[PDB]
Amino acid sequence: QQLASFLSGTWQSGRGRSRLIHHAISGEALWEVTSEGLDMAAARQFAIEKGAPALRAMTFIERAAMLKAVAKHLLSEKERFYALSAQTGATRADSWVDIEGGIGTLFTYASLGSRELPDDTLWPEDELIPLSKEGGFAARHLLTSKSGVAVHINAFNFPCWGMLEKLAPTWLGGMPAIIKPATATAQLTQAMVKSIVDSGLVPEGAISLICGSAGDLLDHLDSQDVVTFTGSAATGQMLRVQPNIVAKSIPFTMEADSLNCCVLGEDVTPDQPEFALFIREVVREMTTKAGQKCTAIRRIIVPQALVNAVSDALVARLQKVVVGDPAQEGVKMGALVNAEQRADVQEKVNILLAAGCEIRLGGQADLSAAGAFFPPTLLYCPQPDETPAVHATEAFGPVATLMPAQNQRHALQLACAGGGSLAGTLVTADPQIARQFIADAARTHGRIQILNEESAKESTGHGSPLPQLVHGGPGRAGGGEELGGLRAVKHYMQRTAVQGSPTMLAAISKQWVRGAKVEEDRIHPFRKYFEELQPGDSLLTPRRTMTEADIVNFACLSGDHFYAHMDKIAAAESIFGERVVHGYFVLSAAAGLFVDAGVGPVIANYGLESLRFIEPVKPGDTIQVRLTCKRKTLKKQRSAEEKPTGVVEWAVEVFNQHQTPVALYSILTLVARQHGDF
Template sequence: MTTSPPSSARSLASFVHGQWIHGQGGTEVLDAVYGAPLARVSSDGIDFAQVLRYGRETGCRHLSRTTFHDRARMLRALASYLLERKEAFYQLSFHTGTTRRDGWVDIEGGIGALFSYSSIARRELPNERFLLEGEVEQLSKGGSFVGRHVLVPREGVALHINAYNFPVWGMLEKFAPNFIAGVPAIVKPATQTAYLTEAVVRAITESGLLPEGALQLICGGTGDLFDHLEEQDLVTFTGSAATASCLKVHPNIVARSIPFNTEADSLNCIVLGESVRPHDPEFDLFVREVAGEMTSKAGQKCTAIRRVIVPRSVTGEVVEALRTRLSGVTLGDPSREDVRMGPLVSAHQRNETRKVVEALCGEAELVVGGEVPELRGGDWEKGGFMAPTVLLCERPLTANAPHELEAFGPVVTLMPYEGEQEASALARRGRGSLVASIVTYDRTEARSLFFGLASAHGRVLMLNRDNAGESTGHGSPLPQLKHGGPGRAGGGEELGGLRSVKHYLQRTALQADPTTLMALTGEYVRGAQVSEDAVHPFRKHFEQLQVGDSLLTHRRTVTETDLVNFANVSGDTFYAHTDEIAARDSIFGRRVAHGYFLVSAAAGLFVSPAPGPVLANYGLEHLRFIESVGIGDTIRARLTVKSKTAKDTRPGERPTGVVEWAVDITNQHDQLVATYSILTLVERTQG
């Protein structure tokens, strides 16, 4: 199959305040493969103040009616809907110059981010509209004044300004966390590939799965949009460091202290350890990783390797290995199955990249590339094709250009080094990068290199023969881990699981008495008023239980028989429990009960043994032993409903919910001797 050159350019539309609007005139976008007109992009006629008002008023209003779990379910449904329509996205993606293999990262990787955040939200967030962070802080000696951090959604919009290289993933990996947080988004894609973003947003709006106002799209310029941003809004930017530095100092951004998160292109590096020899598996892994990063999306990734730091003793072998591997890369129409690398996004981008290569050649030598290879489809002059290019900088410690100039294409610069300190110094000269990779099987060397360069990189991949089979590679950010880096890389953070959701939430320190704090947060706080009745809590269904419902048990005196029997059953014969003489000389001054005996004894005090709504105990958290308990001491327990979370019910399953119970064990002096939480699965009366 071959992608045909587009016959005519179509006008892209923006989706704002609930409708599609076509701008007049605008910028002509050309197909990356053949250079033919593909689309016209303009935002002319859009009232940007109205766009922001619509997001804040309509979007925020509808999202505020939903919980984290509600939004997670919507996100999962949307991901499934988009996945069913992926083939249409792939067909458009070919026009960007991307092969199907590389398009997978953008299209299915972006959809996968929706699935990931849906799972993260349902697993790590409560079924609430706010999030509690950390533990309750005791602010007074008597316990009547306490504090807690509470995170609530910002009442503004998230403006996402994205780069051209990932028109799908770049949008969805940012939209997923802001949507989970309950904040509406305005997406502004890069003009060159906006047609693919527009197609995905059209599918999203046609699905009808998102609340009104949750997502808007601007194709074209931003006009006076920045002038109308307010304090509750946020901006994220992905692109060049130069553009980011201009936008983040916009007078309105500065005056209103509007959060501005930057993920900028950087001079990422890969380091080959000195312990690696050309016959080692790590040597081949290193060469494959470098070549793969050069040819994946034609090197147009913010995470792509730009600087290749190698031991001086094997520089020649690395050059030859790269030359051999790159010689097998086929260029041409990316829709063809026999093509490994497509063009850059445009002929203009190719020409700009060539200019940077010329500048780099002032301090480096061209050792691979520079020729015009045979194309398998496409137009060399009108398209954005460029052969993989390798430069060699013999004196990287004194050179400047390789550490300052980024050729945003299939270009790397080799930098020889001698000694681990020199390798780390070269890595740090990038002035902050998104990612670095270290390839070695020597763990001592790996440790030295990691701590030598970690402070200057947002992510570090340790690559060797043990993880190569499952490693996602140098250039692949993952939803679970942060994406971003210091310095030149922008100093921002994206992804990272729950970390990125919190970026769209306002953290507020709440100070109150325990009962008021419990009433506001819906979670039991030690010292708050509790509710006790004649019905045992374990005899109540999920809906009947309320936060603060409590049971104070009868008492039990600990005996020597308890200690002996528990030691025999558990096999724990630690001297403090079993040796009278040694125990007297211990920090306890006497024989004491096993901590886990206290937990077991407490369960015997509060459990209601007959079958009932409590189906299973599947967790114990935050266990702390406060005071020792000896022979003759008397204990009792207080069991209190701390929080409740209804679980999603699958077909054929019994409806259930998770109840977290706070357990406090006290002695005859009302001193707290142990505290923890248990999690139980409790039956619901309704699905």
């Protein structure tokens, strides 16, 4: 049966030598992959000259709305995805983690791109960097989306999660993608790609698919491309030194296999709940998805006095784990995906047994079975720092070694001896042990979960890479990082420091910055609606003279009787020399000066961005405010009952009779729109 790729807009298929997708729980070939004869240069050509300008013409708000639309359309027809994912030997809960994590990543990136990304093609990430003494020359950083493809090379472990966690920052970062899924489970990836394409939600060319070997794709990539690898280290170290990738100097974000530690602290004793949640976390992490996730615990570091207790509790917790078919009831652990993967797990076990020990059923794995089953394996290493094979070999299944420690100094070194890892866990209750663990072990781990009794209730676990936490570790784990919230959309963009005058930076950024020209047009910026506000709409307010009665009435009304305002003696002994006006009274009299009293488009106050008081305001000191529109960034009207609205940021610049800027800041404001969508 042919597994169809998606290149150059049309569903195509390969012609030549092939690999095939074995079923996991039974063992027959119900798909087969091929990509020979497919033109890769034409697919990259179609992506770059069709779907790249279709994404780059959108704003970030429209791209986040597109991600939310695809997320809802994929959450709707999710039931075929579980049937396609049960072919991988995964259980219902494991496939639930896979599918709903890969769709909740899309919802999370849609929410983040809706909230913190502008209604613009370009995203300015800095405020302003004043490079001149006067103010006529300045700079700010711009993130523009690249003009090429994003070659994503995935692993076989999460066809839904691991493909859609690379695809939401790619699309939110304005680039089209070409997904190369692993050929052991590409049927669920094609189900996802087909469900995306057959919806009309993404433009044509914004997504592709190569079921099978790429081969000629990496030899054709322009310098505006990115390649994001996910797999073993041995493959990505062959693809990093690919000559076009080093020649055109394209970003190659490799992220690879890892030996994830789980260190038990010295303060934990077996008569505590910490010990029970430690054993529960290690067993659940080692049995979730049959140990076929990158963030599975593979090195257990316990104190020396607790080795026999942990090794007797883990086995008694693990003998209740039922290994079998998922559709028959009472089964907790599923199967692996291949007999090739089963043979790989058992040969990595036999490598670990050359200098290790044995606690459970390890190398006794029935290779003559009609199903990729491997028994849940707990190992032992009595000499942990003498054997480098424990700290360099990951048996990619239900296997996790165990090894002692010596009083939270050998434990840190055994946690860091993995050569850079992807996840880790310290189970303690003393908050000063976790300080020492982060101060030495976070150099090598990309993510650390300090698990205690308060955390263990609503934790997501050791093996849940959140879409707003950095997934990626140094060294053996790959070095490259993913999923860092909006850090993940910045790999798909080019960071440029634009220099010039502020009136030029304001038109480049489509904002108002600090020293741009203003557009004062005889009526009030709070009277304009959202669509007729422009960044630059200033307001030179009338003045208000600060006096001693102002200080007295505000200190009475607010209750703020600080000595620099209400004492005549101590204000002379202070840094100010005499009594000064309250900073919050400057902040309140400013809003007395610019706020329209009348009913208009301005709805709420919504917060205040960044306040700084620069010079003190005294009695006998006029105050004049420059209310200037800065950003617009409309919202999405989450219900049809809701009024259409957008959150306009105004840049407030108070000053005094000498025109020096006392107390400049920036207010947000929820402003009504004339037109909506619902």
